[PDB]
Swiss-Prot record:
This is UDP-glycosyltransferase 708C1. The active site is at H15, D112. Optimum pH is 6.5-7.0. UDP-alpha-D-glucose binds at G14, T17, T133, V320, Q322, H337, W340, N341, S342, E345, D361, Q362. UDP-glucose-dependent glucosyltransferase catalyzing the C-glucosylation of 2-hydroxyflavanones (2-hydroxynaringenin, 2-hydroxyeriodictyol and 2-hydroxypinocembrin) and phloretin. No activity with flavanones, flavones or flavonols. Exhibits C-glycosylation activity toward 2',4',6'-trihydroxyacetophenone and phloretin using UDP-glucose as sugar donor. Can use UDP-galactose as sugar donor, but catalytic efficiency is 14-fold lower toward UDP-galactose than toward UDP-glucose. It comes from the Eukaryota.
């Protein structure tokens, strides 16, 4: 006999991906749960819709539960995704009727933090594990957002027991309780204390000081136990990656993989300076830039000479299977915005990271990457893109100390999700607790 659990996903690819990974893991040995995956519809982007469709087509054993939340009307100067997050957070109180009708009766819910207030007030007797999609480090700052304000938009934020958060790494909205993002962050963080636990896509040896402080009581907060369950096993995708034969022809650890995520907000001038920098570095690369087998946007953007020089040394592509790229021995480094999904996929493979963080949690994530020895954070990459790439690419691909520390990160990450590992054991204990 086996428990029936609900995975309650939100919106946005960065948030959907780890939730899909969790549902896939829980539906499979060794957890062997019955999984219902809740999707919020309509979806905002066609990319989201396609990935959800491919997920269910390749995991036919997982049940889909559509939770319809009307799209809010767009408003000038308000980010569309924040408006959608707000509408989801405001709908969470409606989940009881939907989760109660599931059969067999569910044993637990693993939920996006936008559902926290709704779930923990309207279903207080159902174990709710809040699954954050960022680092333990940045999660701690988010849970502190109610206790700011009380403000001082201008001082490093000192949470007891942890290294202070510099102002430049904190999203400025966090100091304004009436900002749309802060509003539902406060609403849901105020109810973290009633979740059964906070799950994090991290592992003990990746953030030991932060996790130690949290679970010893040092932060003085009312959080439940914060439980690393990462890194989560990557999804087997259908189509093996097309660049694998070309990678098979490149020397070991010679290729720089470049991807800033769907979120990235880099101007054409920045993309062009990056291209000029990669070209003058003469490194091999795979670069996800900007539908497409069109090079014309790339030929227009770089102009014809730069485009052809770049294509001599690397691949300019629309999309890749990122875990298949990061897992290949020819890839020697990863230039990334440091979204937490990308960090954890690099960590699993011991791939050194060059961190060019852009916004949100990314600068604290880059600090975590640097603290763990997984990579190097170029703090002012935007102030000189060409020099930044030319100077640091040789270090990423050739510094033996960083290659060594990154490889040991990879060994600890594999051990964490291996049999007996710290993360596998934690998630097994959770699932075991549901078996009466």
């Amino acid at each position: 006999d086996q428990p029936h659990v609900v995975v309650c996903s939100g919106a946005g690819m960065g948030h959907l991906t780890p939730f899909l990974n969790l549902a896939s893991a829980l539906s499979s040995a060794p957890y062997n749960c019955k999984v219902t995956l809740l999707i919020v519809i309509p979806l905002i982007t066609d990319a989201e819709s396609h990935h959800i469709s491919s997920f269910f087509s390749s995991h036919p054993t997982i049940h889909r539960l559509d939770f319809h939340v009307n799209l809010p009307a767009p408003k000038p100067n308000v980010d569309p995704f924040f408006l959608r997050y707000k509408s989801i957070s405001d709908s969470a109180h409606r989940l009881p009727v939907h989760l109660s009708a599931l059969s067999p009766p569910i044993s637990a819910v693993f939920s996006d933090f936008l559902f926290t207030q709704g779930l923990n007030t309207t279903l207080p007797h159902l174990p709710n594990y809040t699954f954050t999609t960022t680092s333990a480090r940045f999660f701690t700052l988010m849970s502190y957002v109610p206790h700011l304000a009380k403000s001082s938009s201008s001082s490093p934020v000192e949470i007891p027991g942890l290294e202070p958060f510099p102002t430049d790494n904190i999203p400025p909205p966090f100091f304004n309780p009436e900002h749309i993002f802060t509003s539902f962050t406060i609403s849901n963080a105020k109810y973290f204390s009633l979740s059964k636990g906070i799950l994090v896509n991290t592992f003990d040896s990746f953030e030991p000081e932060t996790l130690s402080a949290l679970n010893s009581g040092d932060t003085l907060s009312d959080l439940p136990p914060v439980i690393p369950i990462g890194p989560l096993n990557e999804l087997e995708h259908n189509k093996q990656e097309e660049l694998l034969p070309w990678l098979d022809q490149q020397p070991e650890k010679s290729v720089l993989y470049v991807s800033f995520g769907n979120r990235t907000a880099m101007s054409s001038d920045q993309i062009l300076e990056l291209g000029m920098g990669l070209e003058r570095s003469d490194c091999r690369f795979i670069w996800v830039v900007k539908d497409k087998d069109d090079k014309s946007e790339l030929r227009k953007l770089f102009g014809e000479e730069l485009y052809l020089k770049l294509s001599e040394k690397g691949k300019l592509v629309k999309w890749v299977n990122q875990t298949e790229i990061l897992g290949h021995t020819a890839v020697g480094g990863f230039l990334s915005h440091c979204g937490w999904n990308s960090v954890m996929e690099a960590a699993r493979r011991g791939v050194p990271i060059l961190a060019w963080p852009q916004h949100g949690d990314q600068r604290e994530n880059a600090w975590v990457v640097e603290k763990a020895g997984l990579g190097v954070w170029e703090r002012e990459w935007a102030s000189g893109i060409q020099a930044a790439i030319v100077e640091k690419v040789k270090m990423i691909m050739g510094n033996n100390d960083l290659r060594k520390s990154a490889m040991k990160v990879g060994e600890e990450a594999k051990r964490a999700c291996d049999v007996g590992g710290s993360s596998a054991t934690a998630l097994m204990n959770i699932i075991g607790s549901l078996k009466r």
